[PDB]
Amino acid sequence: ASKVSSRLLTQDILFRKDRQATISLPIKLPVEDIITQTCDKITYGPLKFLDLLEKETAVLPLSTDITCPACLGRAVLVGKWECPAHVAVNESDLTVFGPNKEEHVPQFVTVQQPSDGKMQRLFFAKFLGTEESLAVLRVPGPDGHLCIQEALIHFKELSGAGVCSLWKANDSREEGLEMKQVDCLETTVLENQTCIATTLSKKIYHRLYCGERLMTGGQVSTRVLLTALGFYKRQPYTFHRVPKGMVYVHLIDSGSEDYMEYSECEEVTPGRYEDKQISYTFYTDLFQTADGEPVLASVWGTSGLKDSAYESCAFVIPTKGRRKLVPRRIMSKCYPFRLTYHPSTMTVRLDVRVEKHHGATDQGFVFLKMESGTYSEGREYYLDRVLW
Numbered sequence: 001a002s003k004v005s006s007r008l009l010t011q012d013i014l015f016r017k018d019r020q021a022t023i024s025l026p027i028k029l030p031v032e033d034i035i036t037q038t039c040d041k042i043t044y045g046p047l048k049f050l051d052l053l054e055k056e057t058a059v060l061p062l063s064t065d066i067t068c069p070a071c072l073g074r075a076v077l078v079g080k081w082e083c084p085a086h087v088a089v090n091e092s093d094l095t096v097f098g099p100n101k102e103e104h105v106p107q108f109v110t111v112q113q114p115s116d117g118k119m120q121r122l123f124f125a126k127f128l129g130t131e132e133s134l135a136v137l138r139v140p141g142p143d144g145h146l147c148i149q150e151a152l153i154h155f156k157e158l159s160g161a162g163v164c165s166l167w168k169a170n171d172s173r174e175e176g177l178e179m180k181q182v183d184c185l186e187t188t189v190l191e192n193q194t195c196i197a198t199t200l201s202k203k204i205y206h207r208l209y210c211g212e213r214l215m216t217g218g219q220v221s222t223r224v225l226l227t228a229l230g231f232y233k234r235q236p237y238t239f240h241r242v243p244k245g246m247v248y249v250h251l252i253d254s255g256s257e258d259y260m261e262y263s264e265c266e267e268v269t270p271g272r273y274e275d276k277q278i279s280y281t282f283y284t285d286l287f288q289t290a291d292g293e294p295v296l297a298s299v300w301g302t303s304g305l306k307d308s309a310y311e312s313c314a315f316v317i318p319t320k321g322r323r324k325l326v327p328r329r330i331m332s333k334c335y336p337f338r339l340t341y342h343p344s345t346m347t348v349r350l351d352v353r354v355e356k357h358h359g360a361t362d363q364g365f366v367f368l369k370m371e372s373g374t375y376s377e378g379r380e381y382y383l384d385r386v387l388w
Protein backbone atom coordinates (compact mmCIF):
# COMPACT_ATOMS: atom_id res chain seq x y z
CA ALA A 1 0.00 0.00 0.00
CA SER A 2 2.68 2.47 1.11
CA LYS A 3 4.73 1.99 -2.07
CA VAL A 4 2.03 2.92 -4.61
CA SER A 5 2.60 6.25 -6.36
CA SER A 6 0.93 9.17 -4.58
CA ARG A 7 0.79 11.22 -7.79
CA LEU A 8 -1.81 9.26 -9.81
CA LEU A 9 -5.35 10.19 -10.87
CA THR A 10 -7.93 10.12 -8.10
CA GLN A 11 -11.70 10.42 -7.94
CA ASP A 12 -14.45 11.74 -5.70
CA ILE A 13 -18.02 10.52 -5.77
CA LEU A 14 -20.20 13.61 -5.47
CA PHE A 15 -23.66 14.14 -4.01
CA ARG A 16 -25.47 16.74 -6.10
CA LYS A 17 -28.68 18.29 -4.83
CA ASP A 18 -30.64 17.89 -8.08
CA ARG A 19 -30.01 14.76 -10.12
CA GLN A 20 -32.23 16.16 -12.89
CA ALA A 21 -30.04 19.26 -13.34
CA THR A 22 -28.37 19.70 -16.74
CA ILE A 23 -25.73 21.84 -18.40
CA SER A 24 -27.24 24.77 -20.30
CA LEU A 25 -25.55 26.14 -23.44
CA PRO A 26 -24.10 28.55 -23.93
CA ILE A 27 -22.16 28.17 -20.68
CA LYS A 28 -23.15 30.81 -18.13
CA LEU A 29 -21.73 29.25 -14.95
CA PRO A 30 -18.22 28.93 -13.58
CA VAL A 31 -16.60 25.48 -13.74
CA GLU A 32 -17.06 24.73 -10.04
CA ASP A 33 -20.78 25.51 -10.22
CA ILE A 34 -21.17 23.29 -13.28
CA ILE A 35 -19.54 20.51 -11.27
CA THR A 36 -21.68 21.21 -8.19
CA GLN A 37 -24.89 21.10 -10.18
CA THR A 38 -24.37 18.33 -12.79
CA CYS A 39 -21.52 15.96 -11.80
CA ASP A 40 -22.06 12.69 -9.91
CA LYS A 41 -18.39 11.77 -9.95
CA ILE A 42 -15.15 13.60 -10.70
CA THR A 43 -11.63 12.47 -11.62
CA TYR A 44 -8.68 14.81 -11.05
CA GLY A 45 -5.62 14.88 -13.30
CA PRO A 46 -2.86 16.92 -14.97
CA LEU A 47 -3.41 18.99 -18.11
CA LYS A 48 -0.43 18.22 -20.36
CA PHE A 49 0.56 19.34 -23.86
CA LEU A 50 2.98 17.86 -26.40
CA ASP A 51 4.40 19.69 -29.40
CA LEU A 52 2.80 17.80 -32.28
CA LEU A 53 2.29 18.79 -35.92
CA GLU A 54 3.60 22.25 -35.01
CA LYS A 55 1.22 23.12 -32.14
CA GLU A 56 0.94 22.32 -28.44
CA THR A 57 -1.54 19.45 -28.27
CA ALA A 58 -3.53 17.88 -25.41
CA VAL A 59 -5.45 14.63 -25.77
CA LEU A 60 -8.15 14.04 -23.17
CA PRO A 61 -10.41 11.01 -22.73
CA LEU A 62 -14.12 11.84 -22.60
CA SER A 63 -14.21 9.26 -19.80
CA THR A 64 -11.08 8.00 -17.98
CA ASP A 65 -12.82 4.92 -16.63
CA ILE A 66 -14.30 1.85 -18.26
CA THR A 67 -17.99 1.42 -17.64
CA CYS A 68 -19.70 0.95 -21.00
CA PRO A 69 -17.18 1.27 -23.87
CA ALA A 70 -19.78 1.21 -26.68
CA CYS A 71 -22.48 3.35 -24.99
CA LEU A 72 -23.08 6.76 -26.57
CA GLY A 73 -22.93 9.85 -24.40
CA ARG A 74 -22.79 13.63 -24.69
CA ALA A 75 -19.69 15.47 -23.53
CA VAL A 76 -19.18 19.13 -22.79
CA LEU A 77 -15.62 20.43 -22.63
CA VAL A 78 -15.24 23.64 -20.60
CA GLY A 79 -11.84 25.28 -20.32
CA LYS A 80 -10.51 28.31 -18.51
CA TRP A 81 -8.64 30.78 -20.72
CA GLU A 82 -6.18 33.23 -19.17
CA CYS A 83 -2.95 34.16 -20.90
CA PRO A 84 -0.01 35.50 -18.88
CA ALA A 85 0.84 39.14 -19.60
CA HIS A 86 4.00 38.28 -21.52
CA VAL A 87 2.41 35.71 -23.85
CA ALA A 88 0.69 36.95 -27.01
CA VAL A 89 -1.89 34.34 -27.97
CA ASN A 90 -5.38 35.15 -29.19
CA GLU A 91 -8.53 33.20 -28.30
CA SER A 92 -8.81 32.48 -32.03
CA ASP A 93 -5.51 30.59 -31.95
CA LEU A 94 -7.16 27.84 -29.88
CA THR A 95 -8.93 25.01 -31.65
CA VAL A 96 -10.50 21.79 -30.40
CA PHE A 97 -12.10 18.74 -31.88
CA GLY A 98 -13.78 15.58 -30.71
CA PRO A 99 -16.32 13.02 -31.81
CA ASN A 100 -19.07 14.58 -33.94
CA LYS A 101 -17.34 17.98 -34.02
CA GLU A 102 -14.70 19.14 -36.49
CA GLU A 103 -11.64 21.18 -35.54
CA HIS A 104 -12.84 24.67 -34.71
CA VAL A 105 -12.28 27.68 -32.49
CA PRO A 106 -14.45 26.87 -29.44
CA GLN A 107 -17.20 29.21 -28.33
CA PHE A 108 -16.00 31.72 -25.72
CA VAL A 109 -17.99 33.27 -22.89
CA THR A 110 -17.38 35.44 -19.85
CA VAL A 111 -19.00 34.40 -16.58
CA GLN A 112 -18.96 35.77 -13.03
CA GLN A 113 -17.66 33.43 -10.33
CA PRO A 114 -20.04 33.95 -7.37
CA SER A 115 -17.50 32.60 -4.86
CA ASP A 116 -14.90 35.37 -5.20
CA GLY A 117 -16.95 37.53 -7.58
CA LYS A 118 -14.16 37.46 -10.17
CA MET A 119 -14.74 37.42 -13.93
CA GLN A 120 -13.65 34.36 -15.91
CA ARG A 121 -13.05 33.70 -19.58
CA LEU A 122 -14.20 30.20 -20.57
CA PHE A 123 -14.31 28.23 -23.81
CA PHE A 124 -16.54 25.24 -24.54
CA ALA A 125 -17.57 22.61 -27.08
CA LYS A 126 -20.12 19.83 -27.16
CA PHE A 127 -19.38 16.32 -28.45
CA LEU A 128 -21.31 13.12 -29.08
CA GLY A 129 -19.48 9.83 -28.93
CA THR A 130 -18.73 6.66 -27.02
CA GLU A 131 -16.87 6.43 -23.71
CA GLU A 132 -13.61 5.78 -25.54
CA SER A 133 -13.75 9.03 -27.50
CA LEU A 134 -11.31 11.88 -27.14
CA ALA A 135 -11.19 15.64 -26.98
CA VAL A 136 -8.14 17.25 -28.54
CA LEU A 137 -6.98 20.78 -27.82
CA ARG A 138 -4.47 22.65 -29.96
CA VAL A 139 -2.77 25.98 -29.39
CA PRO A 140 0.32 27.46 -31.06
CA GLY A 141 3.75 28.81 -30.12
CA PRO A 142 5.83 27.67 -27.13
CA ASP A 143 3.66 29.63 -24.67
CA GLY A 144 0.16 28.77 -25.92
CA HIS A 145 -0.37 26.03 -23.33
CA LEU A 146 0.07 28.64 -20.58
CA CYS A 147 -3.27 30.23 -21.49
CA ILE A 148 -5.28 27.13 -20.52
CA GLN A 149 -5.39 26.85 -16.71
CA GLU A 150 -7.72 23.87 -16.59
CA ALA A 151 -10.22 21.86 -18.60
CA LEU A 152 -13.43 20.27 -17.39
CA ILE A 153 -15.02 17.43 -19.28
CA HIS A 154 -18.58 16.59 -18.34
CA PHE A 155 -19.62 13.26 -19.85
CA LYS A 156 -23.34 12.54 -19.62
CA GLU A 157 -23.63 8.78 -19.81
CA LEU A 158 -26.52 6.92 -21.36
CA SER A 159 -27.64 6.35 -17.77
CA GLY A 160 -27.80 10.10 -17.23
CA ALA A 161 -24.89 9.95 -14.79
CA GLY A 162 -22.57 12.96 -14.92
CA VAL A 163 -19.06 11.55 -15.09
CA CYS A 164 -16.62 14.41 -14.93
CA SER A 165 -12.91 15.03 -15.16
CA LEU A 166 -10.90 18.09 -14.19
CA TRP A 167 -7.51 18.50 -15.83
CA LYS A 168 -5.42 21.26 -14.25
CA ALA A 169 -2.11 22.65 -15.40
CA ASN A 170 0.49 21.74 -12.76
CA ASP A 171 -1.93 19.43 -10.96
CA SER A 172 -0.05 17.42 -8.33
CA ARG A 173 -1.21 14.17 -9.96
CA GLU A 174 1.50 14.40 -12.61
CA GLU A 175 1.92 10.62 -12.99
CA GLY A 176 -1.83 10.13 -13.58
CA LEU A 177 -1.65 11.00 -17.28
CA GLU A 178 1.53 10.44 -19.28
CA MET A 179 1.71 11.11 -23.02
CA LYS A 180 4.48 10.31 -25.49
CA GLN A 181 4.84 10.25 -29.25
CA VAL A 182 5.47 6.75 -30.59
CA ASP A 183 6.24 5.37 -34.04
CA CYS A 184 3.17 4.40 -36.04
CA LEU A 185 3.34 0.62 -36.63
CA GLU A 186 0.36 -0.09 -38.89
CA THR A 187 -0.32 1.19 -42.42
CA THR A 188 -0.97 4.95 -42.52
CA VAL A 189 -4.62 6.01 -42.78
CA LEU A 190 -4.18 9.76 -42.23
CA GLU A 191 -2.05 12.43 -43.84
CA ASN A 192 0.84 13.50 -41.60
CA GLN A 193 -0.11 10.68 -39.25
CA THR A 194 1.28 11.15 -35.76
CA CYS A 195 0.88 8.46 -33.11
CA ILE A 196 0.57 9.17 -29.38
CA ALA A 197 0.42 6.81 -26.43
CA THR A 198 -1.50 8.18 -23.43
CA THR A 199 -1.23 6.19 -20.21
CA LEU A 200 -3.95 6.82 -17.63
CA SER A 201 -3.14 5.63 -14.11
CA LYS A 202 -5.62 5.97 -11.26
CA LYS A 203 -5.07 5.06 -7.63
CA ILE A 204 -8.16 3.03 -6.85
CA TYR A 205 -8.53 -0.50 -5.53
CA HIS A 206 -10.44 -2.26 -8.30
CA ARG A 207 -11.87 -5.76 -8.46
CA LEU A 208 -13.72 -7.46 -11.29
CA TYR A 209 -16.07 -10.39 -10.78
CA CYS A 210 -18.26 -12.71 -12.79
CA GLY A 211 -21.02 -13.38 -10.32
CA GLU A 212 -18.96 -14.05 -7.21
CA ARG A 213 -15.81 -15.44 -8.85
CA LEU A 214 -13.02 -12.86 -8.72
CA MET A 215 -11.52 -12.38 -12.18
CA THR A 216 -8.96 -9.64 -11.51
CA GLY A 217 -7.99 -6.83 -9.16
CA GLY A 218 -5.32 -4.33 -8.18
CA GLN A 219 -4.31 -1.09 -6.45
CA VAL A 220 -3.93 0.90 -9.65
CA SER A 221 -6.21 1.11 -12.67
CA THR A 222 -4.12 1.53 -15.82
CA ARG A 223 -5.43 2.31 -19.31
CA VAL A 224 -3.34 3.00 -22.40
CA LEU A 225 -4.76 4.94 -25.32
CA LEU A 226 -3.11 4.63 -28.70
CA THR A 227 -4.16 7.56 -30.87
CA ALA A 228 -3.36 8.66 -34.43
CA LEU A 229 -3.59 12.38 -35.19
CA GLY A 230 -3.60 13.74 -38.74
CA PHE A 231 -5.76 14.82 -41.67
CA TYR A 232 -8.21 12.86 -43.78
CA LYS A 233 -7.02 12.35 -47.33
CA ARG A 234 -9.57 14.19 -49.48
CA GLN A 235 -10.02 12.99 -53.08
CA PRO A 236 -10.40 15.69 -55.77
CA TYR A 237 -13.95 16.79 -56.74
CA THR A 238 -15.41 14.49 -54.08
CA PHE A 239 -17.75 15.05 -51.17
CA HIS A 240 -16.55 13.40 -47.95
CA ARG A 241 -18.52 13.12 -44.72
CA VAL A 242 -15.27 13.24 -42.77
CA PRO A 243 -14.59 16.83 -41.74
CA LYS A 244 -11.70 19.04 -42.75
CA GLY A 245 -8.99 20.02 -40.24
CA MET A 246 -7.22 17.71 -37.81
CA VAL A 247 -8.88 14.46 -36.78
CA TYR A 248 -8.01 11.41 -34.72
CA VAL A 249 -8.30 7.67 -35.22
CA HIS A 250 -8.13 4.97 -32.54
CA LEU A 251 -5.30 2.46 -33.01
CA ILE A 252 -5.27 -1.17 -31.83
CA ASP A 253 -2.95 -2.59 -29.15
CA SER A 254 0.34 -4.06 -30.42
CA GLY A 255 -0.28 -7.37 -28.67
CA SER A 256 -3.77 -8.70 -29.36
CA GLU A 257 -5.96 -8.98 -26.27
CA ASP A 258 -8.80 -10.84 -27.98
CA TYR A 259 -8.63 -13.69 -25.47
CA MET A 260 -10.13 -14.33 -22.05
CA GLU A 261 -7.24 -14.88 -19.65
CA TYR A 262 -9.75 -15.65 -16.91
CA SER A 263 -11.83 -18.55 -18.25
CA GLU A 264 -13.20 -19.76 -14.91
CA CYS A 265 -16.57 -17.96 -15.15
CA GLU A 266 -19.70 -20.04 -15.58
CA GLU A 267 -21.30 -19.46 -18.99
CA VAL A 268 -24.47 -18.53 -17.14
CA THR A 269 -24.04 -16.61 -13.94
CA PRO A 270 -25.80 -18.16 -10.91
CA GLY A 271 -28.91 -16.30 -9.82
CA ARG A 272 -32.49 -16.79 -8.66
CA TYR A 273 -35.06 -16.96 -11.46
CA GLU A 274 -38.63 -15.80 -10.88
CA ASP A 275 -39.71 -15.99 -14.54
CA LYS A 276 -40.45 -12.25 -14.43
CA GLN A 277 -36.88 -11.42 -13.38
CA ILE A 278 -33.47 -12.74 -12.35
CA SER A 279 -32.11 -11.69 -8.96
CA TYR A 280 -28.44 -11.68 -7.99
CA THR A 281 -27.04 -11.08 -4.53
CA PHE A 282 -23.53 -10.63 -3.20
CA TYR A 283 -21.70 -9.43 -0.11
CA THR A 284 -19.48 -6.35 -0.28
CA ASP A 285 -17.47 -4.21 2.14
CA LEU A 286 -17.62 -1.33 -0.32
CA PHE A 287 -19.88 0.87 1.79
CA GLN A 288 -17.35 0.69 4.65
CA THR A 289 -14.70 2.28 2.40
CA ALA A 290 -16.81 5.22 1.38
CA ASP A 291 -15.37 7.65 3.98
CA GLY A 292 -18.79 9.18 4.63
CA GLU A 293 -19.04 9.92 0.91
CA PRO A 294 -21.44 8.37 -1.58
CA VAL A 295 -21.16 5.25 -3.67
CA LEU A 296 -21.99 5.50 -7.37
CA ALA A 297 -23.65 2.49 -8.96
CA SER A 298 -23.70 2.14 -12.75
CA VAL A 299 -25.49 -0.73 -14.46
CA TRP A 300 -26.03 -1.52 -18.10
CA GLY A 301 -27.02 -4.45 -20.24
CA THR A 302 -27.73 -5.75 -23.72
CA SER A 303 -29.73 -8.81 -24.79
CA GLY A 304 -27.19 -9.54 -27.48
CA LEU A 305 -28.96 -10.08 -30.80
CA LYS A 306 -29.35 -6.32 -31.22
CA ASP A 307 -26.38 -4.55 -32.80
CA SER A 308 -26.28 -1.72 -30.25
CA ALA A 309 -29.37 -1.46 -28.05
CA TYR A 310 -28.02 -0.70 -24.57
CA GLU A 311 -30.04 -0.33 -21.38
CA SER A 312 -28.34 1.75 -18.67
CA CYS A 313 -29.21 3.19 -15.26
CA ALA A 314 -27.20 4.81 -12.48
CA PHE A 315 -27.76 5.32 -8.75
CA VAL A 316 -26.18 7.56 -6.14
CA ILE A 317 -25.98 5.92 -2.73
CA PRO A 318 -25.06 8.26 0.11
CA THR A 319 -23.48 6.68 3.20
CA LYS A 320 -24.51 9.41 5.65
CA GLY A 321 -27.42 11.84 6.07
CA ARG A 322 -31.10 11.46 5.17
CA ARG A 323 -32.14 8.03 3.91
CA LYS A 324 -28.51 6.90 4.01
CA LEU A 325 -27.66 3.71 2.09
CA VAL A 326 -30.82 4.13 -0.01
CA PRO A 327 -30.07 4.31 -3.77
CA ARG A 328 -31.15 7.46 -5.59
CA ARG A 329 -31.94 6.85 -9.26
CA ILE A 330 -30.30 9.45 -11.47
CA MET A 331 -32.76 9.43 -14.35
CA SER A 332 -36.56 9.40 -14.06
CA LYS A 333 -37.13 5.67 -14.57
CA CYS A 334 -35.05 2.47 -14.69
CA TYR A 335 -37.22 -0.32 -16.02
CA PRO A 336 -34.63 -3.09 -16.54
CA PHE A 337 -32.85 -2.88 -13.18
CA ARG A 338 -33.50 -2.60 -9.47
CA LEU A 339 -30.70 -2.18 -6.97
CA THR A 340 -31.13 -2.58 -3.23
CA TYR A 341 -28.75 -2.76 -0.29
CA HIS A 342 -29.24 -4.53 3.04
CA PRO A 343 -26.94 -2.78 5.54
CA SER A 344 -27.43 -5.42 8.24
CA THR A 345 -26.02 -8.22 6.08
CA MET A 346 -23.94 -5.98 3.81
CA THR A 347 -25.69 -7.61 0.87
CA VAL A 348 -26.48 -6.02 -2.47
CA ARG A 349 -29.34 -7.30 -4.56
CA LEU A 350 -29.55 -6.67 -8.30
CA ASP A 351 -32.84 -7.47 -10.02
CA VAL A 352 -32.84 -7.80 -13.79
CA ARG A 353 -36.22 -7.70 -15.50
CA VAL A 354 -36.46 -10.22 -18.35
CA GLU A 355 -39.06 -11.57 -20.79
CA LYS A 356 -40.79 -14.96 -20.83
CA HIS A 357 -38.71 -17.15 -23.15
CA HIS A 358 -35.58 -18.74 -21.67
CA GLY A 359 -34.25 -21.90 -23.32
CA ALA A 360 -32.57 -21.02 -26.63
CA THR A 361 -30.72 -18.39 -28.71
CA ASP A 362 -29.95 -16.14 -25.73
CA GLN A 363 -26.82 -14.19 -24.84
CA GLY A 364 -27.86 -11.41 -22.46
CA PHE A 365 -25.14 -9.44 -20.65
CA VAL A 366 -25.28 -7.12 -17.64
CA PHE A 367 -22.47 -5.14 -16.02
CA LEU A 368 -22.76 -3.58 -12.57
CA LYS A 369 -20.09 -1.27 -11.22
CA MET A 370 -20.15 0.17 -7.72
CA GLU A 371 -17.45 2.61 -6.63
CA SER A 372 -16.36 4.97 -3.90
CA GLY A 373 -13.47 7.39 -4.12
CA THR A 374 -10.96 4.66 -3.24
CA TYR A 375 -12.61 1.34 -4.27
CA SER A 376 -14.44 0.00 -7.31
CA GLU A 377 -16.19 -3.32 -7.87
CA GLY A 378 -17.25 -4.48 -11.31
CA ARG A 379 -19.51 -7.49 -11.77
CA GLU A 380 -20.34 -9.18 -15.06
CA TYR A 381 -23.52 -11.23 -15.41
CA TYR A 382 -24.15 -13.67 -18.25
CA LEU A 383 -27.85 -14.24 -18.83
CA ASP A 384 -29.73 -17.02 -20.60
CA ARG A 385 -32.86 -14.86 -20.60
CA VAL A 386 -33.53 -12.02 -23.02
CA LEU A 387 -33.20 -8.67 -21.27
CA TRP A 388 -36.24 -6.40 -21.25
Ligand SMILES: *[C@@H]1O[C@H](CO)[C@@H](O[C@@H]2O[C@H](CO)[C@@H](O)[C@H](O)[C@H]2NC(C)=O)[C@H](O)[C@H]1NC(C)=O
Binds near residue numbers: 245
Ligand atom coordinates in the same frame (compact mmCIF):
# COMPACT_ATOMS: atom_id res chain seq x y z
C1 LIG B 1 2.91 17.79 -42.83
O1 LIG B 1 3.20 19.11 -42.30
C2 LIG B 1 2.19 20.11 -42.42
C3 LIG B 1 1.34 20.06 -41.15
O2 LIG B 1 1.32 21.35 -40.55
C4 LIG B 1 1.37 19.86 -43.66
O3 LIG B 1 0.84 21.06 -44.20
C5 LIG B 1 -0.50 21.45 -43.80
O4 LIG B 1 -0.58 21.90 -42.44
C6 LIG B 1 -1.76 22.65 -42.19
C7 LIG B 1 -1.73 23.17 -40.76
O5 LIG B 1 -0.57 23.95 -40.54
C8 LIG B 1 -2.97 21.77 -42.38
O6 LIG B 1 -4.12 22.58 -42.40
C9 LIG B 1 -2.92 20.97 -43.69
O7 LIG B 1 -3.84 19.93 -43.60
C10 LIG B 1 -1.53 20.38 -43.99
N1 LIG B 1 -1.49 19.91 -45.32
C11 LIG B 1 -2.18 18.70 -45.70
C12 LIG B 1 -2.14 18.22 -47.11
O8 LIG B 1 -2.80 18.06 -44.86
C13 LIG B 1 2.29 19.27 -44.72
O9 LIG B 1 1.65 19.26 -45.95
C14 LIG B 1 2.65 17.84 -44.30
N2 LIG B 1 3.83 17.40 -44.96
C15 LIG B 1 3.84 16.23 -45.80
C16 LIG B 1 5.11 15.82 -46.47
O10 LIG B 1 2.83 15.57 -45.99
